Amino acid sequence: RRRQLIRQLLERDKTPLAILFMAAVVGTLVGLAAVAFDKGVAWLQNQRMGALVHTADNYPLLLTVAFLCSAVLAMFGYFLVRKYAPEAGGSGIPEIEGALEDQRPVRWWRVLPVKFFGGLGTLGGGMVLGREGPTVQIGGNIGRMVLDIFRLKGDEARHTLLATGAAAGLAAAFNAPLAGILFIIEEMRPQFRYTLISIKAVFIGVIMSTIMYRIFNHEVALIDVGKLSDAPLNTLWLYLILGIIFGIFGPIFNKWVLGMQDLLHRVHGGNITKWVLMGGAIGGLCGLLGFVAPATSGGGFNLIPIATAGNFSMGMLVFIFVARVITTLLCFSSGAPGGIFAPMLALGTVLGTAFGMVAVELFPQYHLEAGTFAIAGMGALLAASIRAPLTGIILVLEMTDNYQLILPMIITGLGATLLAQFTGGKPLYSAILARTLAKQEAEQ
Amino acid sequence: RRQLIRQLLERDKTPLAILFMAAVVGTLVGLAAVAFDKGVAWLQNQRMGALVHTADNYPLLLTVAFLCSAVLAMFGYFLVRKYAPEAGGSGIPEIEGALEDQRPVRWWRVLPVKFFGGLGTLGGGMVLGREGPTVQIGGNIGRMVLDIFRLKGDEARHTLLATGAAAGLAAAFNAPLAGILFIIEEMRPQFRYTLISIKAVFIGVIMSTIMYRIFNHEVALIDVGKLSDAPLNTLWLYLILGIIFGIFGPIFNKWVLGMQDLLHRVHGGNITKWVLMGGAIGGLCGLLGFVAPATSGGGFNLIPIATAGNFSMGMLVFIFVARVITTLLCFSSGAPGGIFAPMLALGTVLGTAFGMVAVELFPQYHLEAGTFAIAGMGALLAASIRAPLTGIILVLEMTDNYQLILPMIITGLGATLLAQFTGGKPLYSAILARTLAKQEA
Numbered sequence: 069r070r071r072q073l074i075r076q077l078l079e080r081d082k083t084p085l086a087i088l089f090m091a092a093v094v095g096t097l098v099g100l101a102a103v104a105f106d107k108g109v110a111w112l113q114n115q116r117m118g119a120l121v122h123t124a125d126n127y128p129l130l131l132t133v134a135f136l137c138s139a140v141l142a143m144f145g146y147f148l149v150r151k152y153a154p155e156a157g158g159s160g161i162p163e164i165e166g167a168l169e170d171q172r173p174v175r176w177w178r179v180l181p182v183k184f185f186g187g188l189g190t191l192g193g194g195m196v197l198g199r200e201g202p203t204v205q206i207g208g209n210i211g212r213m214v215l216d217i218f219r220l221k222g223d224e225a226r227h228t229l230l231a232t233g234a235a236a237g238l239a240a241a242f243n244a245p246l247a248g249i250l251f252i253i254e255e256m257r258p259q260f261r262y263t264l265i266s267i268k269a270v271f272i273g274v275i276m277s278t279i280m281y282r283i284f285n286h287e288v289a290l291i292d293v294g295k296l297s298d299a300p301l302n303t304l305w306l307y308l309i310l311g312i313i314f315g316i317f318g319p320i321f322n323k324w325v326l327g328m329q330d331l332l333h334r335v336h337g338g339n340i341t342k343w344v345l346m347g348g349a350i351g352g353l354c355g356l357l358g359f360v361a362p363a364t365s366g367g368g369f370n371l372i373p374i375a376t377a378g379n380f381s382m383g384m385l386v387f388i389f390v391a392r393v394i395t396t397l398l399c400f401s402s403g404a405p406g407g408i409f410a411p412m413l414a415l416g417t418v419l420g421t422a423f424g425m426v427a428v429e430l431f432p433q434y435h436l437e438a439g440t441f442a443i444a445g446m447g448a449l450l451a452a453s454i455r456a457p458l459t460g461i462i463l464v465l466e467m468t469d470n471y472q473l474i475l476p477m478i479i480t481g482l483g484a485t486l487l488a489q490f491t492g493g494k495p496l497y498s499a500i501l502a503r504t505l506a507k508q509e510a511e512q
Numbered sequence: 513r514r515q516l517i518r519q520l521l522e523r524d525k526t527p528l529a530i531l532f533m534a535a536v537v538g539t540l541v542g543l544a545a546v547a548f549d550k551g552v553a554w555l556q557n558q559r560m561g562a563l564v565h566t567a568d569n570y571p572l573l574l575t576v577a578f579l580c581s582a583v584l585a586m587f588g589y590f591l592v593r594k595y596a597p598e599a600g601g602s603g604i605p606e607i608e609g610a611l612e613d614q615r616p617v618r619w620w621r622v623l624p625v626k627f628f629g630g631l632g633t634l635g636g637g638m639v640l641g642r643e644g645p646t647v648q649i650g651g652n653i654g655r656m657v658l659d660i661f662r663l664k665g666d667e668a669r670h671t672l673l674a675t676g677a678a679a680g681l682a683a684a685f686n687a688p689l690a691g692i693l694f695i696i697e698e699m700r701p702q703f704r705y706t707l708i709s710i711k712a713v714f715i716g717v718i719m720s721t722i723m724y725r726i727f728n729h730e731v732a733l734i735d736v737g738k739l740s741d742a743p744l745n746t747l748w749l750y751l752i753l754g755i756i757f758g759i760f761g762p763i764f765n766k767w768v769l770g771m772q773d774l775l776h777r778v779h780g781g782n783i784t785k786w787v788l789m790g791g792a793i794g795g796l797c798g799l800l801g802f803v804a805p806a807t808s809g810g811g812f813n814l815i816p817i818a819t820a821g822n823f824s825m826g827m828l829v830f831i832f833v834a835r836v837i838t839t840l841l842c843f844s845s846g847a848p849g850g851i852f853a854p855m856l857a858l859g860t861v862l863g864t865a866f867g868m869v870a871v872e873l874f875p876q877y878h879l880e881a882g883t884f885a886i887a888g889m890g891a892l893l894a895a896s897i898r899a900p901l902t903g904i905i906l907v908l909e910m911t912d913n914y915q916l917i918l919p920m921i922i923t924g925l926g927a928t929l930l931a932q933f934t935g936g937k938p939l940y941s942a943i944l945a946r947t948l949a950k951q952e953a
Binding site for chain 1: 513514516517519520521523524525526528531612614688689692696697702703704705710711714715718721722725726729744747898900901904905908909912914915917918921922925928929932933937938941942944945948949951952
């Protein structure tokens, strides 16, 4: 096999020009799609806000049209999924992950409109869900779409273009190109066997997607924390302790989101009507909370810079955390179209800040800024629950631009994954696919 | 399917033994890489002090410059040619082959040979980098503790070997991310599945990086400072630059390969002619390291200078050409030392050049040439070594100008694309192919 390796080495990295070009197309489409989705979610959230100002006097009435506006939008989302594409419920990343194992179908003709407009309802209603979920699944299906349209034959194309789609999808959701590619090569790709996924091609899609996003969202960052303070070497041991904290909470939050899927299933039993209604109730709750305590609802991107800057009180952080643990499970486990990826950034930033506050008072000699522990913990729930530390770390780096905290970020992230493993926890995205795959056999 | 379901449920459960051992591999590789760096610096400083002793008689001072490096070079080539021929060159191809279980990891020989051999070449001021030594050593160290603790299994032999190479690159650049990325983009077995625990590679990279921070804190290898942003209508220039690197990439690849052939004839494989040739090349660097220091050495010193646009266009042309020559002469000769880092200086210079032209051609873009330098900095890596993701993340970790990530990514990808389309190959895999085929023929 030495003679084969010599053949293989000399023929390394020669991605078929057809695949490379189609990667540029997939990315461009996924980009525009992810942009349009983002524009749509924003608009609906703005319309709801204008409505509350049509009734800004009568508080109980205003408390109602907040609920209703989100309730209806949620119902419309749950319905689009339960009727035309049951696979577009939940994150969508587990499904695209199953597609890469050739174990789950890629019904783009159905999911593309269902996920887009379905998430548009849930997200636009102000439910605690993320854009990645939709954009990654949409992105994958878009990648699959142009594979079928142009009829590109071969395993490489079906795996690549599907991957570049998912990557261009995560990238455009966060303006994080590197994090997109890294998500594919750390988490998304087939984890237990060799694959023919051209990284160079995945790149091209990610580029075009990112470029598209920059064309429509330039000069405003999703998260602006600003340059924080450095982290001394004698400070590092604190970030490991934080990781160990995320490390034991990770699997717990995992059991919850899974178990809550079970618990909420009984509420509707699988029936499209009880489910849509339950969705509207959950959706309406967020729209309500999105006015009476907006930090307990929504994507959470807004409270991240606030928490990092240390403008929240310890009690408020505890409130925001617990209240968001609740509104996250209720929104994701219900089966609503939307990722859990981004709301886990807000959950980490808060929990991290909390640690940072205690750390500040306990060691004035370290001259601590609690915001460093916020950034350290930001991609730590990802590290602990999703078990993709490298992606989370690079993501947070791409969003917060505080590279001088890379050691705290890596240490906390790795401490998370280690204790996540050692405490009998599993990658949330693969634990979902397993549940989905095994049910596909269970009912046989 | 039922297999996958079984596999999913058991995903990411790296054996605790491997995890713990990865932490020691990184710790050792870290300290080792640090000690190597401290050694190289020391020797360069001694040579400098010697030049001060005779800082009057210019021809004499031109001589003791040559001789000090000549001897140090000779000592380096000798240690390799005698006790470990595998420790010549980068060493990254060798560890790559080690991961394919197609080359042996003679740590008992390579560790002292590479360390002290590289200490000679690097400390002599030869245009070579620390990665080569550190990465190769790193892997052996990983292999060393595998043997010592007798960790059985394919996973362990592949993991600990990888975390070692990773910890090696990381501690050579203070770039933890780029280290892990190097293993998962370039180093690891490229054509089949492997049992390399990423989480374990991380732990080694951490501890290694931590060790480096413990001894080299508060001073960056490259400090450019925060540059200006890059407007969207400016992006097309970064593609053009990547296309330039994309066609020069393979050419520089033929040269490094071809010069290995050409320099072989000079010594025929004979240890004496070789060591003497090495001393001549090494002596040249020590000479050049005084008459035009930019034409010799690692090149890390001229990167910030070039990026801030303190060089003239002609000086850049000079530095480039003169460094293309001194890079080939140093790496192709078989001297222990990577070509990785001197490609950074080659990229930074070529980029700035492009940046200078771009500035005067389009005053409306309000350009700063230093942006194209950073864009081009990991572009030769992108073009010749064909590991763009690692190169881009490396430069990012070294220059901290994330607001140029699109230029950096576009230029890097424009490099790798044209590098492919112009019939070039991954230098590190083109070398392993050479070696592996010379073996079965």
